[PDB]
Amino acid sequence: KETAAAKFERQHMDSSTSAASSSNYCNQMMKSRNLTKDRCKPVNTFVHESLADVQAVCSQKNVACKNGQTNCYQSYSTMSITDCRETGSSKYPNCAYKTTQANKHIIVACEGNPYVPVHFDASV
Numbered sequence: 001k002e003t004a005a006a007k008f009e010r011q012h013m014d015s016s017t018s019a020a021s022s023s024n025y026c027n028q029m030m031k032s033r034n035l036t037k038d039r040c041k042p043v044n045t046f047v048h049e050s051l052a053d054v055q056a057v058c059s060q061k062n063v064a065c066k067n068g069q070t071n072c073y074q075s076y077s078t079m080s081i082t083d084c085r086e087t088g089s090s091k092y093p094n095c096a097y098k099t100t101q102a103n104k105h106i107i108v109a110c111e112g113n114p115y116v117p118v119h120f121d122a123s124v
């Protein structure tokens with residue numbers, strides 16, 4: 001039902017805050033973006049930049065994805081991100097996440113017309 005571009009937006013964009021300011025950020029966000037509905041998604045990164053700035057990464061440095069594909073792009077500049085990772089104690093339906101805020105380059109895979117992000121590969 002969901003398009004790949006829409007799924008990327010839902011899972012990875014949070015332009016409403018400039019950074020995670022709370023250890024509970026990931027618990028709240030993972031739930032509100034419906035990433036804990038049927039299982040606990042083990043890892044997920046939110047990006048705190050405008051949608052335009054993230055879409056613009058598809059015209060920046062072309063690099064290999066972890067899987068060997070060559071439609072990945074690394075941002076020229078660092079971006080505000082929050083990594084959310086399940087803790088060792090987490091068990092569905094009570095998903096529990098560690099929140100780690102950082103400023104780093106992002107790497108996304110791009111596809112389509114318009115050519116936009118569809119997968120979050122990594123941050124560096």
Ligand SMILES: Cc1cn([C@H]2C[C@H](OP(=O)(O)O)[C@@H](CO)O2)c(=O)[nH]c1=O
Binds near residue numbers: 008011083120121123
């Ligand atoms: C390593 C890493 C993976 N992931 C993601 C990308 C994926 O979802 P997606 O491909 O929908 O963007 C996923 C594995 O399926 O874990 C992050 O969101 N942040 C990370 O730092």
